[PDB]
């Protein structure tokens, strides 16, 4: 017989909910960091639809040999630009886990949704570590489903922020967003947002880079998960910069921290796996800002499958498919 | 919502019975030949089971702007060494269409039999265009899942085949395998008094290592080299013709003899499958040598044909709607 365990979106997350994502994360992160992930080369498939718009899908494998014990997966996002405009998500697809003897897929989830809490869960890790102790309040750019995940893992991890200051170039999304105890202050501009707390988190899909140094506290933290919002004077007058993979960052010369390190030196302290170990100290805002530059891990999304998949076996949740069908 | 129609592997069989699955790959080696697919690099992740068995995924992606408009998708096969000794088919996994104007996965289906079904159905074009005229029996060396739809795709193609010549190392194995109905099955000793037993081979073992010389061939014979690595350097150089899929894809995965012989200096490729149908290059059937076929297989062809057994399981009311989200 041949079975697959297909788990929806609804699952997933009762899943996550069930589980410690950050711990999952930083389990990986410590795998990663002592050469125990292998990560290959993404299958890449661009086109054009029938509209003229950037279509992709991108096929990225992934193996953990892990504190606990080795996973094997896969992690397929598909996105079309023109999706959003149809009233669509940017990006969605499915994940895979291997059976380490068969090698056969045993498991299937959407994966669009384990992808952005990973995002957030490791927002989570790289707080807990390296940002300010007992912060009270955090600051979004963009006000989205990135922002709601974000609230959500604050509630779960940060329980003394209770204030979150927003801005979003889209008013109306900005004025709509809620938050998990949390009140939300709408400000008019980035900068207002940007000056309120101690804690940024950017989440736009911006080209052009539009925050300076000048704009942050003494003490401050900031999350760069949209990847081009910060100035490149941010990185280079950083009190430090952490990483998530340093490699992955370079070969994406796209975004501006990729570009920097293609011009020449730039003061990377370390990756947030390094500090983990113990392999680089760890450096808490105290009179500057702290980068965090995280381009996404895929094998963070495989350990997080696996770990949801664990939960989903033992609280009999998902529907199991016959690939065979007599 | 965002839903997928999924179809198992028995579904993916009644689908083939109702279609040209050979008249789909000729379609899509012309749209490939003109230029217009796309075949990224496969991924691959390799590793080793506790048993010390090797494991390995691959995601071969591929797009197909061809005959019945742009398809996209993508085929998943993975393969444990020690699959058949716990008594496991050796390879196993899923494939996805992706909607053309969205990118989201819109079918989900079984794959192992798919692949070996578009597998075949490439022996079968190499047959019609490359093979003697009129053959009558057809040798195998291994009688697995390949020799299994191989036999299925010899009954609707070449009807005149009665007779299979088939050897395999593990002879239980060779005892099993019937062919389809119209077949006398011939099980011989070695490989040598299979592959001697007529004018047409059909390589289908998993070996890394090659032991098939030139000498073996009767003159006007013909070998589909499907598992890659039987046939000892000789038999390309010695070759009365020597045709591929795709040189460059070839050329790319030298762990396989025919990409170590280009690596190492010049060998006498004749053209592609492709060529030959868009009238790039002449045929050659065979004469008074042996003619190679050495395909290593494009996911355009998976892509191409998913793509119409997921059409006509939609007008048949087959396989069944999966949603993605479950509110
Ligand atoms: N060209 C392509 O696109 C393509 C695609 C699929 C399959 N293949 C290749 O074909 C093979 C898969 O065949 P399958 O799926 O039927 O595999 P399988 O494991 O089901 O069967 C292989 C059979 O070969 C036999 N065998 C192994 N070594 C042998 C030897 N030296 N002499 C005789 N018999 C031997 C085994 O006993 C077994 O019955 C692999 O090499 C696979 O990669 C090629």
């Given at each position: 017989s041949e079975e697959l365990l297909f788990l929806d979106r609804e699952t997933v997350r009762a899943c996550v909910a069930g589980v410690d994502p950050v711990e999952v994360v930083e389990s990986v992160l410590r795998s990663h960091a002592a050469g125990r992930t292998t990560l290959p080369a993404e299958g890449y498939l661009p086109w054009e639809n029938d509209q003229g718009a950037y279509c992709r899908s991108i096929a990225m494998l992934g193996a953990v040999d892990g504190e606990r014990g080795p996973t094997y997966g896969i992690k397929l996002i598909n996105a079309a630009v023109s999706n959003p405009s149809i009233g669509l998500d940017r990006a969605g697809g499915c994940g895979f886990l291997f059976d380490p003897?068969?090698?056969?897929?045993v498991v299937l989830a959407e994966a669009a949704y384990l992808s952005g809490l990973r995002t957030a869960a490791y927002t989570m890790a790289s707080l807990r570590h390296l940002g300010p102790v007992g912060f009270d309040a955090v600051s979004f750019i963009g006000t989205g489903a990135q922002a709601r995940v974000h609230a959500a893992l604050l509630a779960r991890?940060?329980?003394?922020?209770?204030d979150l200051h927003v801005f979003d170039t889209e008013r109306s999304r900005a004025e709509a967003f809620t938050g998990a105890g949390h009140t939300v202050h709408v400000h008019d501009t980035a900068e207002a947002a940007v000056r309120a707390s101690h804690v940024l988190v950017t989440l736009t899909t911006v080209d052009d880079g539009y925050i300076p140094h000048?704009?942050?506290?003494?003490?401050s933290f900031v999350a760069?998960?949209?990847?081009?919002?910060?100035?490149?004077e941010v990185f280079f007058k950083s009190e430090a910069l952490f990483v998530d993979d340093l490699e992955l960052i370079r070969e994406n010369p796209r975004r501006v921290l990729g570009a920097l390190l293609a011009d020449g030196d730039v003061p990377v302290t370390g990756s947030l796996g390094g500090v983990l170990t113990g392999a680089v100290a760890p450096v808490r805002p105290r009179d500057g800002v702290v980068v965090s530059n995280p381009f996404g891990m895929a094998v963070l999304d495989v350990g997080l499958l696996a770990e949801v998949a664990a939960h989903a076996r033992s609280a009999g949740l998902g529907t199991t498919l016959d690939l065979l069908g007599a």
């Open positions: 003897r068969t090698a056969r897929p991890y940060f329980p003394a922020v209770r000048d704009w942050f506290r003494p003490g760069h998960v949209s990847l081009d919002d910060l100035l490149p």
